[PDB]
Every structure is written in C-alpha cells, then in structure tokens.
Design a protein around this ligand. Structure first.
Ligand code: ZN
Ligand code: ZN
Ligand code: ZN
Lengths: 521, 502, 507, 125
C-alpha cells in the first residue's frame, strides 16, 4: 500500500454482469447422499493446478492466455477429494494476482463463455460480446472472478460428454515498458481457487476406481537411472537440438501423456531393435545372406492388416545395426533329447531394398561364416552399429521397400514458440570398427513411457511445465515444457550438452499453454 | 457384551492443535472391508496360535486410508464386525479379546485371553458379531509418522474345531466410531507412512527378467530338491530396500565397464580388466556391498560382446577408433574378483585389443553348460575371503508350499542344452517397489492371478515382505495361464493362512 | 494473516508440574535477531527456493538459551518479525508457511506451499510483518533432555524479482528475521545450573594457528592448504572425532601417543638388516585384545611409508650398578606397507642399520621423529592392519565435499627425513587441541553443518569462512589449490548452525 | 514532504527501551558550585565533532560505523566551555540525518551499550 508510491493502480472496480446461479441444493431430491467438505478448504485460496501463466513481449495481442473449464480439478484439495465421489454441482471462485512492475504498461480481458459455444476462433472484439472485464497488468490487489455453473440438468457425472462454463483470458495490449535499462520485466501471474458456498459432492464410490479423475504425476527417477527408448543402452546426457533439425519423426519411444502408444513402440526394454522369426533362404554372395519370416515378439503370427507400420520393436532409422543371431533347434538331434545351438554375429542393413519388415521379410548378413541352418527359429540381439556408413537417425526407413508408402506413422513434432528448440536424451553407441562417435537421441526415457502407460491419467492442458531440480543444492537449474505429444522443448540459442549433475530429476510444477515464455538457459 | 469406559476422541486434543477439522458423516454408515481383513480357520490349527492381530489406525478403512493422505494426525476409535462361513458339521469356538497398549502378547494361554474384555462365538453361526475397539492412550493425539503402540484385537481358537480339508473363510469389516477425527491439513500424497501398497498392472508379455537382461515367457514352480535359494540380482523388499548387487536399469544387468590393464597368453588371449561402477565413478571396496552393482551372480561362462572406444582421436583426425569383439567371463574361476576390482575375460584366438583403453561388456547368453549351477553365489574376492554383506536366503516354512519362479530361457553359443534362468521378482516390480516405497502392514501379502475379462481369479500366492512368492502345489510344472492375466493385491495376512490348492 | 487458532502454552502444564516459575519482563519485549535469520533475494533465483526453514525452541533467543541451563523444561511459542529492504521500483513476492512437527519438508513445489497456513507478501512492503509460531505438541511440556520435533516456519520465493540494475552490480533485496517470546512461553522447574547436558552450547577454543598442533604426527602446524584436484574423498584413521565428541578409528587423546607403540621383543632374524619382531600392548600398559571393535591399537600410524624413529629399551631385572637396570637406544624404521606390519594381529617389525644391540624379551618403546625417505610415501592409503589373510574392518567413514564448487581444508605440516631429496608434508582434518576440546565438552550438535569464520585480530574482520561438518572436517569454497595466506595469529569463531544448502562466499 | 513523491519513508516510529536516568541535580549536596549554560546552546542542534560518516557499497555488513562515548566533547560549544570547569554530570541528545536517495535500499541498527561492557567483538546478533 505505502510501499508502492502511488505508481501503480491499487484496485480494480469492475464486475461481470452475471446472475446468481443455483448450485447443489437444486439437486437434492434426486441424488443419493449430498456429502460435505471440510470448512478449511472452503475459506482459503489455494493455487490451482493451472496456476502459472506469464505475459511477455514475445506475445502477440489476441492470444488466449488462460482457458479454465469448470470442474473439481481446479483445486488441489478437491482433486484429491473427487476420486471417491460420483458427481458434483456448483461453482468456484477464482483469484488472479498479476501485480507487475511500475514501468510496464498492458491490459488483459477476461470473459465468460457459455457451455456449447465454440472458443477456438475468438477475435479480440468477439470476446467483448460476452460478460467481460478489462484489467491492466499493474494492479496491486488481486481480482475476483465468478464461475457460476450454468447447466440444463440437476448435476454432473464424471463422464466427459457435458460442456461447462469457461473463463477465457486474452492479451489486449502489447505489454510495452519505458525502463531505462534493457532488463527483463516479464510479468508472472498466478491463479488461486477455492469452492463456492453452493458446491457439494454427490455419492460415495470406491476410491481411485473411475477414470476421468486420475491425476498426472511424474516418477522421481534421476538421470542416472533412466534408459534409452530407441536403443537398449543407458542414457548418458541431455543435449539440445541443432539448428538444422527443426522437426523429428522416430517411431520408437513415442507415447502421449494420456497413455497412448504410437508408432512401433512397446513396453519391454529388451525388445528394442530386436525381432524373432524363421530362416527361409540362403544367398551365396561374397557375404552370406539369409531371409527371415519375422513374427511378433510374443510368439504369434504377424498379420499385415493390423493398424501399425511394422512389427513392434523393429529398428526405426537408416543404418547397419550390428548384433548377434542365435539358433535353437525345434527338434532333438542328440544328448538326451537336448537341442543343439549356434550363435554368430550379424548385420541388418535398413536402407536397402531387402529390409521390408511390414511385408514379413528381414534380410540379414554374416561375414564369411556360412554356418546357419534353414527352417529353425532365430532371435536377434542388438549390440550397436558396425560402421557409420549411411547412418542417419532422423530418416524413417521404408517398411515395405520401394514402390510402396508408409502407413499409420506417428506424427512429426516441432516447437512453435519463438526462440525454442528441442531437448533430447543422448546415448553413445558402440561400433565394431572404424572411426566415429555416433549417438542416438530419444524424445522420452523408457521408464516415463511405462509410467504414462500404467497411470493413463488425462491431460488438463496441452503443455506441462517441469523444472530440473538439484537435490544436493536445493536450487532449480533450468525449466522446460513437456508437451502432450511426448517431447520436451527448451529456450536456448546453442547446441551443446546440458551440464547438470546426473542425480537430478524433473519436477512437475503446473499446467501451461503454448504461449508460456520459458526462462532462458 | 463387552464393558469398557467411554474414551475421548480428537476433541480432547483441541487446545494443542491448529485446525479442528471435520469428516464426512456418510462414512460412518457402511461397514467396509478392511485392507487386512482376511483370515482362515482350519482344523490343522490349534488353540494357542494367534490368528488375527489388528492394531488401531486409520488404515483399517479404505475411505479413511484415502483421507489420511491429506492430514497430519488422528485420534479416536473404530468399530469392527466379523463374519464366518461354516456349515453345520464344524464344531468349535473362537474368542476375540481387546489387549491394552503396552501389554506383551507372546505366548498367551487360551484361558488367559478370557481375562480381557472378550466375546466367544460358535462357528455354526449366521450373524456377524460386533467388536468395539477404543483408543486408550496417554497422550493427546497420534502422528502419522511416529509409531507408538496402540490398542489391539487378538483372535485365537478356543476349542479344537473338529470338522467332519474344510477351510473356514472369515472376513473383517470396519467403520469409524463417532469420536474419530483428523488433525491438520497438509499437501496430499507427499508424506510417507500413509501410502497404500499396490502392484503394477502389467501382463506377462511386458515384464523383463531381473537376473539376465531378457524377457520372461512362463511361470514355474520350484523342483523338490531346491528348498532354499540365495541370489543377488533382483533382491528387493516390499518397502523398497535394494539388497545385494541390485540396481534399477535393465540394460546394465550382467554388465560392467572399466580399463584393460594387463595381458596374459594361453590358448586364448586373455586381457585382465580393472572395473569401475556403471555410472562412471571410481570403485571403493570399503562400501557395504558384495560387489559392483550388476555383476553376474551365478557360476558359469557368460558369453557376450566387448567393445572398445579409444580416448584419443589421433587416427582419422577428428574422431577416435573402435574395436568390438566377443568375450567370455567365467565367474567360477580364481581371477574373477570384482570385490577386489579385477575381472578377466577371454576371446578365442583374436588379439585385436589395446591396453589402457576403456571397454564395456554386453551379455548375450552362455556358451557352455559345464559348471553352470545357478544357485551358487560366486566368491567375489576369490579364495581366502568370506562373502560379506550378502542378501539373506529365502525359504518357505508352511507345510506343502513351494517357490514360484519366473522362468526365462537363455541363448547358447555352442553345444547341446536348453538352459533356464529363474528369478524371484520381475524388474518392473523392483522398479515400482523402489519408486512408491509404501510400508508393509504385515509380513505376508496375498495376491491373486486374474482373468481380466470375467474377473475370475485363477490361483493365489503369498508375496512375502522379503520379496518372493510361494504357491501351494505338489508338482513342479509350468503354470498355464491366459495371455492377459496379471496379479492383484488383496490383503495382508499372517503365517497361518492356508492357501487354496493349485 | 496466517489462519491459525490459539494454542495453549505452559498454563496447560500447571497441574502436572511443581514450581510456577517466572522470567524477566524485559526479555518479553525486545526483538532479538535469529541466529540463521538472514537471506537475500536475487534475480538469479527461481521460484520454489527455500530461504529460511526456521524452527521453534529456546535456541532462537540467546537470553532464553542462557536461562535454559537453570531449568528442567519449557512450553510455549514465539513471535517472528520479518523486515525487507527494497524500494518502489521493484516487483516480486514471497510466501511464509506454517509447517507441522513431523511433516518432512524436502523439495516442495511452489504450488504445494500454498496448501499450508500462509501469507503472501510483496517485496515492496515498507512495514515489518509479524507472524505467529505456535507450540503444537501431543504432551504437556517439553523436557530439556528428551528432544522431540517442533513446528517449523518456512520461507519460499513465489515470484521472481523484476528490477532494473545500476551498473556492473544488480539490485538485491536483503531480509532479516527477529524473534521474541510469546506471552505464554515459560520455564518449569529450577535445577542446579550447568549440570544437565543437552543445554551446553557448542564453542571453539581461542587458540591461534601458531599454538595448535597436528593430529596425525607429533609436529606443529605450518600453514593451511586446500585440497588438490585429484583428491576428492579421503579416509584417514587419526584425528577423527565428531563435534559431539566421539573418537573414531584409532584416534586417542595424547599428543605423544601418535605413531607410537610399546611392548616386548620376541624374535630375531638377520637376512640383511636386523628385524626384531615386537609384540605390542596399548599405550597405557594393558594387554591388547585382538577381538576388540577398534581396527588397531590406538595411536599406530595410518599411512604407507617408512617411519624413522628412536627405539629405547629398559630391562626388567637389575644386572649391575647396585640394582639400577641398564639402558639402550638406537634408530629404527617401521615400514607400514609390507606384510610384516600387522598391528591388529599384534606384530610390528622394525629395522636397524647394522646395530646388533637390542636384547630380546625385554620391553621397548618407539618414539617417532620423521620419515626414512620419500619412497612409498602415500599419505592417503590406509594400510592393511591385519596384513594379508584379512581385510580392514570397522574403520572411520570416508568424507567428501558434496556441494558444487567446494574443496577440503587441510592443516599442512612439513616433515624431517633421515636422508634423501624431498619436501613432504602430512595433512590433517582437525588439530589435536580441537579433538581434546570436543571430547571434554561433548556439546550436542543442533544441526549437521556449523559455520565458522577466520578472524584477523587487529581489525576484527573476517578473512574467509568455512563449513565445519558433524563428522569432523572443514570445507571452503575455492577453485584453486594453494596455501592460504593469512596472518599466523588468527583463529576461528563459531557463528551459527546452518543447513546443507548454505552457499559460502567465494574465497 | 511533498517534494519526495511518497517514494521514501517519511518518519521512524521506534524508541529505545531505556529508563529516565538522573542528571546533575542528584550531585548537588556534594559539589561546589553547580554552574549553568547559555540557553541558546541548550535548545539548538549543532553538528558534533564526530559528525560525518558514510554508508557505501564497499562496506561489509556488521561494521561499526559509529561509536560515541558520552562526554562534553560531543558538542563544539560545550567543548570550548568545558576547558574552564572541573567536572560534569548528565546526558546528551543526538540527532542523525540520513536521508538517502529513493533508489537505494539498506538498514542500520543503533544500540545502547553499558559502561563496563566490551564493544570490540560485537556480532550482528
Ligand atoms: Zn552362404
Ligand atoms: Zn594375447
Ligand atoms: Zn640381527
């Protein structure tokens, strides 16, 4: 009050033109129990899981900075309480703290959008056709907004087929500043929620049984415990994307945060860059080549009319993968009816016309060792690459050879905010011979893929804001954006190994959108 | 029929707390089954053994166990009811008593348990009986982190129970007394000591072996001459403690890395190697470990590939050179001493290795089945040294039970055979137990293998606190299952629970 | 304000205690600065950084910490006052939360600290704010002996600092925390003063660098020397004693007992040099039980090398001179890297250059001087105390600086030789006088790290600061390895107990 | 008042917790004359001979910036008057003007130390 010298506006005197809407007392004669809530949660403002957003000079006017659907997932206490109830009815109370510096100048607009109205293409003047309020970014005392639960039935259920009343923020001015120094004056804003007096839960169910109420969590695993999801080795370091790479497409190690596997991704660590089949041919060139009818990795025949580009776990890059193939006979030739065994080196070229794993054929090679039976089962175990000839890790091989197209591919991913590049997890691979130091970068570790598949929690936004925490210092090193497609982006200008301690971990902070300005590394 | 004084709740602790919260009144309506409310009574039991031991807490109710992850303390009592399931031919009686906080219950006679507040019931009954469990204490309230003793319910057989094989199934259902309340709101799901125990929902085609880096293909019951095992990779309690040479990464099992420091000559060129840790740290043999985490823990001849990348880039002018060849690590011989810090290898008639250059091992399988006995832990310091800091040996104690394994088949290089590596837990279970690290409310858990389409449980086993599973079977055979089955945590039991025959 | 209900104090404990004591009313008014109550907020910080982590108790107020050594117990809360130093052309916010006793505060999110009783204050606030720190417990009062956890109060950066700088230095908000007792704080029961342990405060002796001495060899201290780049984790066996006064390894109390042994002679051989195998007892005269939990008898050397010294012999029976026994004393060398130096088994072998004058079966006494030569001189290798056929058991743990950018701080002392070329030195962690003072005082450690400062006596200002750990070693925040150039008549002064997250000023 | 735009604190509202101490009227029955002082010197603030000190960014926190012993040499008029008297009894009144710029930020602490207490090694707490 007295600390600010009269340089900023102290309070906002403007209301939304909304009517008092009924809550859960309307739903009383048709529901079952009408449970209650602890009175400390009712009367204290707590930061929402959609809490953080920033206004920056990189933002253009007319961008949607905030889009809050009504629910019990707007409060971190109600989000834990709502996992043992069946439904709800009622509104919330939202508080926005946006007290910026005294040298900046900008304005924001908040509006109330009805249930079945589309929000995807609002102009800056269409948002003034709703009950709205205009707030500048220098106000000291925080503003209060309603969220009144307009509906046409008695209460809601935990199903996803009823649209609800939203609040929508938009940038309304360019956020200029007339400070004398060239210093960062980017405004940091917070959103704090508490339930209305007319809010209640409905009906006690078993806890943590229903979907639609599971929360998103990250596992606490350090960088030394992570594993690569494109090759069966361990993760060495993190490494930013070069200026030539702007979008990637790599069918292994891909999973959305909702828990959907895409491309040829699977869950087993041992099944990456590996296959299993039956030798059907013999080719006598300078080197020895064989044809293998591959199956799935569990022991079932591979149907080519499945909705996948390849059998799950095949190599997804151009190169020459080096490994060891082994044989075990289906019959019993000798030794108390024990089968005999052979195991030799191999090489799988994936850029040629003989690597068509969607059709069913994978052709390998062994150098000058033609000791391999026909019509016996085989298994491939990858070690690395034999040479860096024709090694490009960002080109997808043709899974049906030439004269065909790849189908059901996972989509490409790229950053969109200005000044941001991709953040990879880099492991260095062994070679058989030659000069090189190759590397394979993955989007996600394999443990995160398994965790996202087991939890199957929904996503309340498109981007999640994480931070890299050093546990021996207790101070955050950098922050990043975890996208719903399953990739991370950072705000940097170089391409270099990120030098961090290897016993640090990522911590989930908040849900943001695609206009959040990251802090520069 | 009991008679005790009325005992206060958390309203006594009002002037020394912060918030004075309340609770949902609809939780006091239904009786909900306890998370450790399963026990059986059989005519193989005798009066004198304690069949049930329930300590008072918020974990006796699945709604209070969910609410207790956002609060800090509690005080108050709970109400208990018990159901039995027996026909008219059973003939016995069973007694339930209320035992104070600091009383020793070790070898109580059945005629001494009647000197408490008690009830006695016939087994041929059809109605559930009620047990009041108050909260006697000499402090103001309880914390969720410190653990002082509390008031119990102790069950025991009272008459032999001659039944004219037939196992009576009993269940416990609890609900909170009206004087129960919590203390102080905290961030939810961040304290320990209130996290419930769960298993991952993963099918058998998604789990990998924890002793050799390959996949699991079938379950197996232990043979008759194998009565106790002691392995080092894959040892983990249900609390999250990693014992032995156990780590979390799948890609590092039976693997190591270091420097080539010496050279010997024989039929096959040899190459002595000084090893380090897998993360890249110098190994100190003054730690309390058997050996470097992840080294092989059985006696055999491990066949793999050794790769070498140089440390200077002189050849080629921008990048360093690369050498990769096969290897054998014999773990039964005299020069396999990873505790001391040296592991010797062998390549057949191939000499292209360079000394003082960093290397790496990648296991593929074995090559020869001679000296392959997978239940001997090798001498990690050679001779003239006892193995220190080993993981304890595990063995069933109930009559008729044997070990359930997770079998996986290994690739050989040459010769004849079909070897098999058996493990206790999969690697994903070890990972889950390390991340969640929920406490153990008892010593033995109870799981069931479930067909997920119909919901029917196919068989059941006993998952112990030490990290192993035992079934009740008479033969040694593969377990035949549907393709999408998994395990599910059911209850916490004691050592007197009789399993259904497999 | 923080949503907290009133909590009872020492008036709750009235019908279960016997004396009804009061204190001075002037202490209940003055605001005294907390011992670790200061922090600065910088533009480099990120949201979610913990800044205070204070805790309730009589150790906040140095008047109550002096009165607490007369009484038997206490109960009650305090009043906290937070001041800031900013101006009107700034932006940023802080949060102050109230954490219960048994709740672990370990890397909390900035969202998760809003789920406590909290206030959110801007960095522009002109007036100092007042927070309550109540005494939540599940008993009637606390005892001065039995320690139990108490309610903490935690500060955290909520929103980063936005300001424009002045020049080559950026703006910085500095904060101070002051406390005073609540009107319901009180003590319980008058006892004799300074009798009970657990109330004794930790101090350091006022001895300068010229008056102290080495703890791994009986030589005086020469200088201070930061650890090299290839030295990251040491493990010695002499000079090891925790701040609570527990002697670890083979550490004893006497200065003259370092690298010294005593016992009888049993054997004689002469392959080249004279050998004289020697059985050993303790340094007081008791037979050494080899099954003791100690790694070796207390005061044997703890490094590889060839310790050159003088061995004397005084025989039991009186041969001549009217019942006065005879004497002899020569030079010898004990090598510690060979397979003959087994003090855990009970045998130490010496070596004498061509002097066959040492009678067997008469007791001896070794007095070390220096080294034989710099051959096999590795001062950071623990010798095999049982030779071969056994490994070293029950040692002291290894110590290492875990903070990014910190090195160990040693006490360097040079050493004489018998012959040859070199300038060797023995580095120790703590002096012997610090070990003796910590053993005699036995004051408890309130935290895991203590903060000390080197003091120049004529100006009274600090030259550098270091972190004294509970295990008995010091670390400084320096990036080189060089002798520390300070005046020789300086000493250290104990400042406060800090956390494991205190960043030292760069040296 | 109005020239500073509300950018700086205008006044300090804090006292030291000291009691009223007697002066030279206590010493009357044992002394000789009890002389007096010109009333213009009594009611006007004059700069002390220890008058000037600065706070700078070169200063470390915890430095003693000011140490005033009681005497008649704290006033330039009393220091000239005191050269013809034998003794004194009583206190003084000190005024510190420290009105700095509106962009700076710092704090000072002033304390009252008894007669026979050592001041050479005070910590900030
Ligand atoms: Zn061929
Ligand atoms: Zn050779
Ligand atoms: Zn001799």
């Amino acid at each position: 009050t007295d600390g600010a010298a009269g340089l900023v506006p102290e309070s906002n005197n403007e209301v939304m033109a909304l009517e008092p809407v009924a809550g859960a007392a309307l739903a009383a004669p048709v529901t079952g129990q009408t449970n209650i809530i602890d009175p400390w949660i009712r009367a204290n403002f707590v930061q929402a899981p959609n809490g953080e957003f920033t206004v920056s000079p990189r933002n253009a006017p007319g961008e949607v900075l905030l889009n809050l659907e009504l629910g019990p997932e707007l409060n971190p206490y109600l989000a834990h309480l709502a996992r043992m109830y069946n439904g709800y009815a009622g509104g919330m109370e939202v508080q926005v703290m946006l007290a910026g510096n005294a040298f900046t100048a900008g304005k924001l607009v908040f509006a109330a959008v009805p249930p079945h109205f589309p929000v995807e293409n609002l102009s800056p003047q269409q948002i003034t056709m709703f009950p709205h309020v205009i707030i500048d970014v220098r106000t000291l005392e925080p503003v209060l907004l309603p969220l009144p639960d307009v509906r046409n039935n008695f209460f809601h259920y935990n199903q996803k087929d009823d649209p609800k009343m939203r609040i929508v923020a938009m940038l309304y001015t360019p956020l200029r500043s007339n400070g004398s120094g060239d210093d960062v004056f980017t405004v940091s804003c917070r959103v704090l929620t508490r339930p209305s007096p007319d809010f209640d839960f409905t009906y006690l169910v078993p806890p943590t049984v229903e979907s639609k109420t599971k929360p998103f969590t990250l596992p606490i695993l350090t960088l030394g415990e992570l594993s690569n999801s494109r090759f069966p080795v361990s993760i060495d370091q993190m490494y930013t994307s070069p200026n030539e790479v702007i979008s990637v497409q790599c069918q292994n190690g891909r999973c959305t945060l909702d828990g959907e596997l895409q491309g040829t991704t699977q869950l087993q660590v041992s099944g990456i860059c590996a296959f299993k089949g039956e030798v059907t041919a013999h080719l006598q060139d300078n080197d020895h080549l064989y044809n293998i009818t591959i199956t799935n990795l569990n022991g079932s025949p591979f149907d080519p009319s499945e909705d996948i580009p390849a059998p799950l776990g095949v190599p997804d890059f151009q190169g020459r993968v080096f490994g060891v193939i082994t044989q075990r006979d289906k019959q019993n030739a000798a030794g108390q009816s024990q089968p005999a065994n052979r195991g030799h080196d191999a090489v799988v070229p994936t850029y040629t016309a003989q690597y068509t794993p969607k059709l069913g054929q994978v052709q390998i090679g062994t150098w000058q060792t033609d000791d391999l039976k026909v019509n016996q089962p085989v298994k491939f175990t990858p070690v690395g690459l034999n040479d860096t000839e024709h090694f490009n890790q960002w080109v997808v091989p043709r899974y049906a050879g030439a004269l065909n197209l790849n189908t059901n591919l996972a989509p490409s991913v790229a950053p969109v905010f200005p000044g941001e590049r991709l953040l990879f997890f880099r492991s260095y691979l062994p070679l058989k011979g030659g000069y090189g130091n190759p590397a394979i970068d993955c989007l996600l570790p394999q443990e995160w893929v398994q965790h996202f598949y087991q939890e199957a929690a929904p996503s309340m936004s498109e981007v999640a804001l994480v931070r890299y925490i050093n546990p021996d210092t207790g101070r955050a090193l950098f922050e990043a954006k975890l996208h719903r497609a399953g990739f991370m982006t950072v705000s940097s200008n170089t391409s270099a190994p990120v030098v961090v301690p290897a016993n640090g971990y990522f911590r989930f902070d908040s849900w943001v959108n695609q206009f959040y300005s990251l802090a520069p590394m």
